[PDB]
Amino acid sequence: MMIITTMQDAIGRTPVFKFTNKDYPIPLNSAIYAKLEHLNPGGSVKDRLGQYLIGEGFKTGKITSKTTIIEPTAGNTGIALALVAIKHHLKTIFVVPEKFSTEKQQIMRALGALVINTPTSEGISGAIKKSKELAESIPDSYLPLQFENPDNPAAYYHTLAPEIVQELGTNLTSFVAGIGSGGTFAGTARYLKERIPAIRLIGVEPEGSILNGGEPGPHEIEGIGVEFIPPFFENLDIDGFETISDEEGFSYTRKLAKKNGLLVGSSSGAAFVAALKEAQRLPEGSQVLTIFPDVADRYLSKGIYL
Amino acid sequence: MMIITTMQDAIGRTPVFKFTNKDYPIPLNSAIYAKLEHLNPGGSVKDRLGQYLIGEGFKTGKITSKTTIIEPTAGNTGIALALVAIKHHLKTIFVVPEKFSTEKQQIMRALGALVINTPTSEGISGAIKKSKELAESIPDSYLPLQFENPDNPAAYYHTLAPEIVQELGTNLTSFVAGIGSGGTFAGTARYLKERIPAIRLIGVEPEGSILNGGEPGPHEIEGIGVEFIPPFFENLDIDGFETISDEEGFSYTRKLAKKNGLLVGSSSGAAFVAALKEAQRLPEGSQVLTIFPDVADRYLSKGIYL
Ligand code: MET
């Protein structure tokens, strides 16, 4: 491999898992390609976001040696920012709704971050509000606000999307990806659409998310789901959103481990189910791309694998 | 990176982290290189053992298509064997003392293994006894018994050690590694000694292990420690053993996360402190190799980072 002097040097260049009709009920000569972002050193796709936000921040002068980074997060963005902050010894404060993965919060604190909790029932919106309060009261603070910052999708446009095309070329029928903030989906989709105008775009949410108009509500699937429509979707021709039940998402999370040796989180299982439904509706020979965002190990304290 | 159809394709080719006097009290022009085996897809160095045992088993006829693999394990070897078994659809049975490592047992089961528990107070020896009973009573079984099988050190001799010399060359002063069964240390040391006759060999154990003549007793560090001499050391010229207290091992586990963004187990922290002591006693310009065996994530329920 390589000799590294920073864990930042290990971010990206992740493999792609190829699934065919020999693995799962998929049409003849069709394939699903899953970009394995869980193999990042921070254990999620958000490692790329962290690296990009801090890197660009130093270039624009939004981040200096004096800066405290404050961000609301479900966990992974916090881990990624804390990991990347180490090289420049930046202080970090993450606002996390309480019952999101305790493992992720432990890891954030292990990396030197302060973790402040908000109530689970105010969701991510409550975390955003609280993060804004802290920033006003902390000198030299910087609030990336992944939920609205166009640098969120741009991170993936510039890092993850080029890697996909480098490995897979332009022979893709569809791109299917879970939506939380919407950055991964929107940034990657923009890049693919520029090179593959005919590609189909499917966003994936759990039951109790609002993208298909349904009522908001709790869901065991963690990492995806929106409480507000992401602002990153305006220039995008999205073909549909796929709503995945907890039962189905966890079922395919368990199958990915048992059948394929992939130890991925419930948001990966959800994305995979959505990719299987998309492959099943397309002609033979279709090539469907998805992303597996994070590792299963941060959810062992919950049901995952039961 | 690559397109893979089995998670086995992703075993090995791990990076090496280089530490200098910028990071820790290491003499001028000296360095510590840590082979990052925690980044294997099963989360540990044992992935190499699993891959080797199954590969060679097919080669010698010890394993065929409807062999059942049986092994007593306190976790990582079970994960590795279960992960590798998937490709060839082999069934696996692991005998694990109840209360040894829950997270690791969950992962074993997730990968398709049957996990059978023994009493905690009978320790690993109770698991070994029970595993022996199963093997006799199951036709076409295979019972590696890693703790006495010479194929344990051979795995590292053939896989890990050549990879290290390809990346780092022959300018190594010392090899410092934790001892559980002793396979990693013995296999790697044999190969390094052949290529680098002057290399120093230091085995690492926690307090309450017996290699430096201390009294046997429990230790919170997980994965390393012996209550008796491993049978793998007969033809090794070992320079010393380093006994690491739980306080020191856990302290350096926390430092690796906080200072370096490395999320590694307590046996990595222990190895690292031993490597730091070794670097500190050698001339300027010395190059010390160590191995970080596994990921921190499987120990968050045990307060690894408190
Ligand atoms: C977009 S939320 C930020 C963190 C990541 N979504 C997680 O699940 O931890």
XYZ file of C-alpha atoms and ligand atoms in Angstrom:
621
model
C 0.000 0.000 0.000
C 1.751 3.141 1.276
C 3.614 4.872 4.115
C 1.452 7.660 5.624
C 2.104 10.338 8.282
C -1.547 11.427 8.543
C -4.777 9.435 8.482
C -6.009 12.082 6.016
C -3.694 10.408 3.483
C -5.889 7.273 3.738
C -9.227 9.035 2.831
C -10.865 7.963 -0.430
C -9.726 5.639 -3.218
C -12.297 3.136 -1.940
C -13.201 -0.121 -3.755
C -16.449 -0.916 -5.518
C -18.355 -4.117 -4.826
C -19.976 -5.725 -7.896
C -23.244 -7.659 -7.472
C -24.860 -9.754 -10.265
C -27.827 -12.127 -10.713
C -25.493 -14.795 -9.141
C -25.776 -12.897 -5.782
C -29.330 -11.479 -5.755
C -32.462 -11.617 -7.994
C -31.335 -8.988 -10.635
C -32.071 -9.206 -14.438
C -29.687 -11.183 -16.642
C -26.417 -9.291 -17.362
C -27.395 -6.455 -15.025
C -25.096 -5.393 -12.186
C -25.123 -3.285 -9.049
C -21.931 -1.456 -8.094
C -21.637 -0.260 -4.520
C -18.983 2.305 -3.694
C -17.625 1.104 -0.282
C -17.261 4.416 1.562
C -17.414 2.587 4.901
C -13.750 1.665 4.329
C -12.662 5.283 4.875
C -10.435 5.717 7.984
C -13.217 7.505 9.871
C -15.587 4.701 8.871
C -17.871 6.747 6.568
C -18.304 8.681 3.329
C -18.240 11.882 5.389
C -14.428 11.682 5.642
C -14.402 13.261 2.136
C -16.716 16.074 3.297
C -14.565 16.787 6.355
C -11.427 16.935 4.311
C -13.009 19.217 1.701
C -14.723 21.649 4.151
C -11.575 22.229 6.233
C -9.286 22.397 3.129
C -11.459 24.974 1.358
C -12.016 26.844 4.657
C -8.265 27.484 4.963
C -8.193 28.686 1.285
C -11.165 31.088 1.628
C -10.016 32.352 5.067
C -13.218 31.044 6.698
C -10.927 28.810 8.810
C -7.721 29.962 10.505
C -5.458 28.663 13.306
C -7.794 30.479 15.747
C -11.007 28.743 14.583
C -13.407 26.533 16.575
C -15.538 24.386 14.234
C -19.167 23.973 15.346
C -21.477 21.580 13.456
C -24.832 19.821 14.089
C -24.507 16.136 13.093
C -26.021 12.630 13.469
C -22.441 11.498 14.109
C -20.400 10.745 10.983
C -19.830 14.342 9.914
C -18.561 14.969 13.456
C -16.135 12.051 13.264
C -14.847 13.237 9.847
C -14.387 16.841 10.962
C -12.699 15.811 14.247
C -10.349 13.433 12.346
C -9.341 16.102 9.785
C -9.093 18.856 12.473
C -6.226 16.979 14.136
C -3.573 17.963 11.555
C -4.189 21.701 12.246
C -5.050 21.215 15.969
C -8.505 22.755 15.478
C -11.051 22.613 18.326
C -14.451 21.138 17.437
C -17.921 21.200 19.031
C -20.616 18.841 17.735
C -24.329 19.138 18.513
C -25.894 15.699 18.358
C -29.536 14.731 19.068
C -29.248 12.451 22.082
C -30.164 8.902 20.929
C -28.124 8.927 17.708
C -25.360 6.298 17.948
C -23.593 6.518 21.345
C -20.596 4.813 19.608
C -20.228 7.760 17.224
C -20.307 10.187 20.147
C -17.633 8.180 22.006
C -15.434 8.303 18.874
C -15.960 12.063 18.458
C -14.826 12.612 22.070
C -11.897 10.147 21.574
C -10.740 12.402 18.635
C -10.798 15.520 20.891
C -14.290 16.945 20.100
C -16.787 18.419 22.592
C -20.226 16.736 22.130
C -23.390 18.620 23.226
C -26.748 16.767 23.025
C -30.196 18.124 22.055
C -33.527 16.239 22.463
C -34.170 13.424 19.949
C -37.706 14.747 19.211
C -36.376 18.172 17.960
C -34.290 16.045 15.535
C -31.570 17.524 13.395
C -33.451 20.874 13.172
C -33.042 21.332 16.967
C -29.315 20.513 16.675
C -29.004 23.191 13.920
C -30.664 25.823 16.114
C -28.432 24.979 19.085
C -25.259 25.015 16.932
C -26.218 28.561 15.740
C -26.555 29.736 19.421
C -23.072 28.472 20.325
C -21.434 30.174 17.282
C -22.719 33.624 18.293
C -21.236 33.085 21.809
C -17.816 31.631 20.660
C -15.136 33.963 19.116
C -13.590 32.893 15.766
C -16.248 30.192 15.283
C -17.031 28.545 12.035
C -20.324 26.831 11.282
C -20.135 24.754 8.044
C -23.915 24.071 8.117
C -23.695 20.985 5.913
C -27.516 21.082 5.640
C -27.397 24.223 3.443
C -23.736 24.872 2.412
C -23.211 24.290 -1.371
C -19.651 23.129 -0.470
C -21.343 19.966 0.834
C -22.387 18.614 -2.642
C -19.222 20.224 -4.138
C -17.042 17.982 -1.900
C -18.468 14.865 -3.601
C -18.497 16.463 -7.048
C -14.696 16.994 -6.719
C -13.613 13.729 -4.894
C -16.031 10.750 -4.911
C -17.715 11.263 -8.312
C -14.447 11.386 -10.357
C -13.270 8.140 -8.628
C -16.483 6.391 -9.805
C -16.019 7.393 -13.385
C -12.303 6.471 -13.233
C -13.224 2.881 -12.216
C -16.580 2.358 -13.959
C -16.436 4.711 -17.006
C -19.602 6.186 -18.461
C -21.506 2.816 -18.709
C -24.034 3.555 -15.937
C -27.798 3.310 -16.232
C -28.780 4.594 -12.799
C -27.434 6.224 -9.630
C -29.270 5.347 -6.404
C -28.168 6.905 -3.086
C -29.512 7.578 0.422
C -30.301 11.160 1.386
C -29.654 12.804 4.743
C -28.301 16.287 4.018
C -28.522 15.405 0.313
C -24.869 16.396 -0.398
C -23.547 12.945 -1.465
C -26.499 12.363 -3.795
C -26.598 15.864 -5.294
C -22.821 16.340 -5.740
C -22.295 12.888 -7.251
C -25.449 13.160 -9.417
C -24.351 16.516 -10.883
C -20.936 15.105 -11.881
C -22.460 11.925 -13.412
C -25.161 13.873 -15.278
C -22.482 16.075 -16.897
C -20.762 12.946 -18.321
C -23.779 10.604 -18.609
C -26.831 12.784 -19.475
C -29.185 9.782 -19.783
C -28.390 8.366 -16.290
C -31.397 7.875 -13.966
C -31.305 9.394 -10.463
C -33.066 7.779 -7.445
C -32.824 9.154 -3.918
C -33.431 6.840 -0.999
C -35.141 7.621 2.341
C -36.571 5.528 5.214
C -40.246 5.432 6.152
C -41.053 8.509 8.268
C -38.996 10.809 6.014
C -40.949 13.460 3.993
C -39.388 13.400 0.438
C -42.362 11.389 -0.989
C -44.852 13.592 0.933
C -45.367 11.172 3.877
C -45.824 12.163 7.541
C -42.586 12.708 9.557
C -41.856 10.025 12.159
C -39.181 7.923 13.901
C -37.262 5.274 11.953
C -34.608 2.765 13.108
C -32.602 3.235 9.847
C -29.873 5.735 10.807
C -28.126 8.345 8.664
C -30.771 8.926 5.993
C -34.123 10.651 6.238
C -34.964 14.320 6.029
C -36.943 16.674 8.254
C -36.796 19.416 5.538
C -36.390 19.257 1.694
C -32.632 19.682 0.916
C -31.848 22.916 -0.997
C -29.390 21.029 -3.263
C -31.949 19.417 -5.592
C -33.112 22.447 -7.660
C -31.045 21.937 -10.869
C -31.501 18.125 -10.741
C -33.723 15.865 -12.784
C -34.540 13.271 -10.072
C -36.490 10.303 -11.459
C -37.914 9.320 -8.048
C -37.413 8.772 -4.349
C -37.584 5.256 -2.913
C -39.028 4.946 0.621
C -37.594 1.905 2.470
C -39.152 0.379 5.562
C -37.001 -0.363 8.596
C -37.870 -4.056 8.241
C -36.620 -4.216 4.646
C -33.541 -2.028 5.269
C -32.334 -4.047 8.247
C -33.114 -7.318 6.441
C -30.772 -6.402 3.564
C -28.165 -5.037 6.001
C -28.087 -8.548 7.548
C -28.018 -10.222 4.090
C -25.008 -8.060 2.994
C -23.058 -9.390 5.993
C -24.196 -13.042 5.767
C -23.968 -13.362 1.959
C -21.191 -10.898 0.953
C -19.128 -10.291 4.111
C -19.978 -6.586 4.084
C -20.316 -5.116 7.600
C -22.263 -1.984 6.707
C -24.821 0.222 8.501
C -28.612 0.191 7.984
C -28.375 3.145 5.524
C -26.274 0.837 3.255
C -28.899 -1.923 3.456
C -31.578 0.664 2.596
C -29.603 1.970 -0.380
C -28.956 -1.604 -1.521
C -32.687 -2.535 -1.396
C -33.442 0.589 -3.433
C -30.722 -0.426 -5.930
C -32.260 -3.927 -6.215
C -35.709 -2.389 -6.940
C -34.147 -0.094 -9.551
C -32.237 -3.015 -11.219
C -35.519 -5.034 -11.236
C -37.388 -2.250 -13.133
C -34.647 -1.718 -15.801
C -33.815 -3.793 -18.937
C -31.318 -6.645 -18.880
C -27.742 -5.385 -19.029
C -28.421 -2.304 -16.871
C -25.629 -1.016 -14.568
C -26.793 0.545 -11.259
C -24.439 2.522 -8.980
C -25.073 3.001 -5.225
C -23.049 4.104 -2.191
C -22.608 2.230 1.103
C -21.986 5.154 3.515
C -20.748 3.685 6.850
C -19.641 0.719 8.953
C -22.026 -1.510 10.995
C -19.792 -1.486 14.124
C -21.116 1.926 15.278
C -24.618 0.373 15.634
C -23.864 -2.804 17.626
C -25.320 -1.163 20.820
C -28.625 -1.107 18.901
C -30.367 -3.920 17.044
C -28.085 -4.163 14.007
C -27.701 -7.956 13.276
C -30.835 -8.985 15.373
C -8.932 1.200 -5.800
C -10.584 -1.862 -7.526
C -13.784 -3.777 -8.343
C -14.310 -6.752 -5.972
C -16.838 -9.628 -5.872
C -15.702 -10.945 -2.471
C -14.588 -9.001 0.628
C -11.668 -11.471 0.710
C -10.193 -9.596 -2.252
C -9.675 -6.624 0.116
C -7.578 -8.536 2.804
C -4.017 -7.228 3.229
C -2.050 -4.526 1.374
C -2.525 -2.330 4.447
C -0.798 1.051 4.925
C 2.007 1.799 7.359
C 1.832 4.797 9.687
C 5.193 6.538 10.245
C 5.786 8.261 13.597
C 8.796 10.553 14.225
C 10.097 12.933 16.949
C 7.378 15.392 15.706
C 4.665 13.067 17.093
C 6.188 11.384 20.186
C 9.555 11.318 22.117
C 11.417 9.309 19.430
C 15.170 10.120 18.927
C 16.310 12.377 16.106
C 16.176 10.578 12.708
C 14.507 7.520 14.253
C 11.002 6.383 13.306
C 8.308 3.943 14.314
C 6.379 2.229 11.547
C 3.047 0.718 12.479
C 1.484 -1.720 10.116
C -2.238 -0.858 10.213
C -3.821 -4.326 10.258
C -6.994 -2.912 11.817
C -7.904 -1.633 8.336
C -8.447 -5.214 7.074
C -12.146 -5.794 6.140
C -12.723 -7.999 9.213
C -11.171 -5.295 11.390
C -8.062 -7.263 12.473
C -4.736 -8.835 11.503
C -6.449 -12.227 11.937
C -8.020 -11.798 8.468
C -4.618 -12.912 7.109
C -4.674 -16.050 9.326
C -8.202 -16.913 8.210
C -7.336 -16.502 4.578
C -4.178 -18.584 4.880
C -5.752 -21.451 6.934
C -8.667 -21.901 4.493
C -6.458 -21.478 1.366
C -3.888 -24.052 2.534
C -6.638 -26.367 3.879
C -8.039 -26.694 0.339
C -4.454 -27.271 -0.865
C -3.614 -30.117 1.580
C -7.081 -31.697 1.488
C -7.764 -30.769 5.125
C -10.758 -28.705 3.803
C -13.301 -29.628 1.086
C -16.691 -28.208 -0.010
C -18.658 -29.658 2.956
C -16.067 -29.358 5.674
C -17.288 -27.566 8.816
C -14.687 -25.257 10.420
C -14.637 -25.377 14.254
C -12.411 -23.044 16.355
C -12.310 -21.810 20.000
C -11.723 -18.021 19.913
C -12.044 -14.869 22.028
C -13.191 -13.121 18.860
C -10.982 -11.931 15.982
C -9.974 -15.335 14.627
C -13.702 -16.211 14.450
C -14.499 -13.048 12.506
C -11.635 -13.745 10.083
C -12.613 -17.373 9.495
C -16.308 -16.521 9.064
C -15.459 -13.738 6.555
C -13.199 -15.986 4.454
C -15.645 -18.965 4.661
C -18.295 -16.964 2.719
C -16.508 -17.176 -0.649
C -16.482 -21.022 -0.574
C -19.846 -21.325 1.281
C -18.194 -23.144 4.255
C -20.090 -23.521 7.569
C -18.262 -22.381 10.738
C -18.745 -23.043 14.488
C -16.996 -20.844 17.073
C -16.711 -21.694 20.773
C -16.488 -18.485 22.792
C -16.514 -18.048 26.595
C -19.754 -16.201 27.464
C -18.906 -12.587 28.346
C -15.574 -12.648 26.424
C -16.475 -10.225 23.595
C -20.169 -9.586 22.749
C -19.624 -7.228 19.794
C -17.219 -9.721 18.200
C -19.733 -12.557 18.775
C -22.491 -10.469 17.100
C -20.189 -9.979 14.084
C -19.339 -13.704 13.905
C -23.056 -14.555 13.832
C -23.742 -11.717 11.338
C -21.223 -13.462 8.985
C -23.088 -16.803 9.232
C -21.175 -18.567 12.072
C -22.775 -20.735 14.789
C -21.476 -19.338 18.121
C -21.511 -21.758 21.117
C -20.776 -20.281 24.552
C -18.907 -21.813 27.506
C -18.730 -20.472 31.123
C -16.614 -17.337 31.612
C -14.809 -18.828 34.648
C -13.496 -21.829 32.594
C -11.901 -19.169 30.351
C -10.441 -19.990 26.969
C -9.457 -23.498 28.124
C -13.181 -24.344 28.539
C -13.819 -23.209 24.951
C -10.888 -25.378 23.716
C -12.233 -28.484 25.500
C -15.732 -28.008 24.091
C -14.393 -27.384 20.538
C -12.447 -30.724 20.744
C -15.714 -32.579 21.629
C -17.559 -31.099 18.639
C -14.774 -32.044 16.136
C -14.821 -35.723 17.141
C -18.644 -35.754 16.806
C -18.867 -33.857 13.443
C -17.803 -35.781 10.272
C -15.463 -33.873 7.924
C -14.633 -31.227 10.577
C -11.528 -29.086 10.651
C -10.184 -27.792 13.976
C -7.227 -25.412 13.383
C -6.352 -24.955 17.108
C -4.473 -21.774 16.263
C -2.786 -21.828 19.716
C -0.718 -24.929 18.801
C -0.955 -25.127 15.002
C 2.379 -24.180 13.264
C 0.210 -22.901 10.373
C -0.626 -19.941 12.650
C 2.902 -18.348 12.455
C 3.267 -19.682 8.875
C 0.334 -17.511 7.784
C 2.198 -14.342 8.738
C 5.486 -15.635 7.368
C 3.848 -16.014 3.904
C 1.540 -12.914 3.784
C 2.161 -10.068 6.278
C 5.963 -10.248 6.528
C 6.786 -10.112 2.763
C 4.358 -7.196 2.360
C 6.228 -5.289 5.106
C 9.628 -5.771 3.472
C 8.157 -4.714 0.069
C 6.948 -1.402 1.633
C 9.771 -0.665 4.117
C 12.836 -2.525 2.771
C 15.517 -4.017 4.986
C 16.462 -0.853 7.024
C 14.718 -2.078 10.167
C 16.440 -2.090 13.529
C 13.742 -3.760 15.612
C 10.412 -5.609 15.406
C 8.069 -5.104 18.334
C 4.741 -6.977 18.458
C 2.079 -8.101 20.937
C 1.820 -11.805 21.807
C -1.456 -13.651 22.320
C -1.029 -17.078 20.700
C 2.377 -15.807 19.512
C 1.684 -16.554 15.806
C 1.870 -12.958 14.464
C 5.128 -12.289 16.307
C 6.781 -15.632 15.540
C 5.785 -15.822 11.849
C 6.744 -12.256 11.054
C 9.938 -12.439 13.132
C 11.124 -15.601 11.325
C 10.734 -13.923 7.918
C 12.370 -10.621 9.034
C 15.287 -12.474 10.661
C 15.967 -14.319 7.390
C 16.112 -11.010 5.437
C 17.522 -8.782 8.209
C 19.793 -10.946 10.431
C 20.688 -8.008 12.730
C 17.034 -7.155 13.592
C 16.042 -7.049 17.281
C 12.885 -8.926 18.316
C 10.719 -7.667 21.221
C 7.482 -9.422 22.257
C 4.859 -7.367 24.062
C 2.606 -8.563 26.903
C 0.315 -6.828 29.424
C 0.866 -6.882 33.216
C -0.331 -10.241 34.553
C 1.276 -12.142 31.656
C 4.298 -14.392 32.576
C 6.983 -13.874 29.831
C 9.157 -11.577 32.066
C 8.698 -13.948 35.058
C 5.845 -11.936 36.673
C 2.910 -13.621 38.440
C -0.148 -14.524 36.273
C -3.242 -12.320 36.740
C -6.065 -10.577 34.806
C -5.543 -7.496 32.628
C -7.964 -5.121 30.835
C -5.736 -5.029 27.681
C -7.470 -7.353 25.198
C -5.907 -9.742 22.686
C -2.413 -10.138 24.147
C -1.097 -11.904 27.246
C -0.057 -15.442 28.016
C -0.370 -17.600 31.137
C 2.376 -19.962 29.793
C 5.143 -20.063 27.094
C 3.760 -20.260 23.497
C 5.131 -23.293 21.562
C 6.166 -21.095 18.567
C 9.342 -19.512 19.947
C 11.725 -22.545 19.946
C 14.058 -21.339 17.120
C 13.738 -17.577 17.573
C 16.450 -15.377 18.976
C 14.212 -13.043 21.068
C 15.966 -9.985 22.527
C 13.327 -9.209 25.153
C 9.726 -8.962 26.281
C 8.095 -5.700 27.275
C 5.411 -5.786 30.035
C 2.865 -2.951 29.647
C 0.491 -1.936 32.441
C -3.174 -1.473 31.612
C -2.829 2.188 32.653
C -0.009 2.781 30.139
C -1.564 0.691 27.323
C -4.964 2.377 27.555
C -3.277 5.798 27.883
C -1.469 5.317 24.558
C -4.622 3.874 22.953
C -6.320 7.206 23.822
C -3.290 9.217 22.566
C -3.296 7.386 19.198
C -6.917 8.508 18.671
C -6.562 12.081 20.066
C -3.172 12.889 18.524
C -3.121 10.738 15.336
C -6.776 9.852 14.490
C -5.980 6.144 14.820
C -8.952 4.223 16.249
C -7.172 1.078 17.395
C -7.658 -1.486 20.192
C -5.836 -1.561 23.545
C -3.382 -4.190 22.160
C -2.287 -1.559 19.572
C -1.727 1.034 22.320
C 0.290 -1.575 24.241
C 2.396 -2.447 21.167
C 2.924 1.223 20.467
C 4.202 2.077 23.996
C 6.558 -0.922 23.749
C 7.783 0.393 20.396
C 8.307 3.864 21.936
C 10.416 2.324 24.741
C 12.411 0.368 22.180
C 12.976 3.466 19.929
C 14.085 5.439 23.008
C 16.798 2.871 23.883
C 18.255 2.629 20.311
C 20.751 4.974 18.517
C 19.499 7.957 16.512
C 18.446 6.806 13.043
C 16.900 3.533 14.273
C 13.737 2.206 12.528
C 11.233 0.271 14.702
C 8.420 -1.798 13.162
C 5.219 -2.641 15.089
C 1.750 -3.990 14.251
C -1.601 -2.504 15.272
C -3.813 -5.635 15.368
C -7.471 -4.470 15.506
C -10.052 -1.666 15.538
C -11.180 0.211 18.669
C -14.900 0.031 17.683
C -15.455 -3.445 19.147
C -14.434 -2.141 22.600
C -16.557 1.033 22.931
C -19.020 -0.823 25.285
C -16.025 -1.502 27.552
C -15.022 2.175 27.826
C -11.869 1.789 25.734
C -11.717 5.638 25.457
C -12.466 6.530 29.159
C -25.864 14.151 7.572
S -25.816 13.719 9.311
C -24.037 13.833 9.634
C -23.458 12.538 10.170
C -23.948 11.294 9.423
N -25.185 11.592 8.651
C -24.238 10.177 10.431
O -25.154 9.388 10.195
O -23.528 10.124 11.446
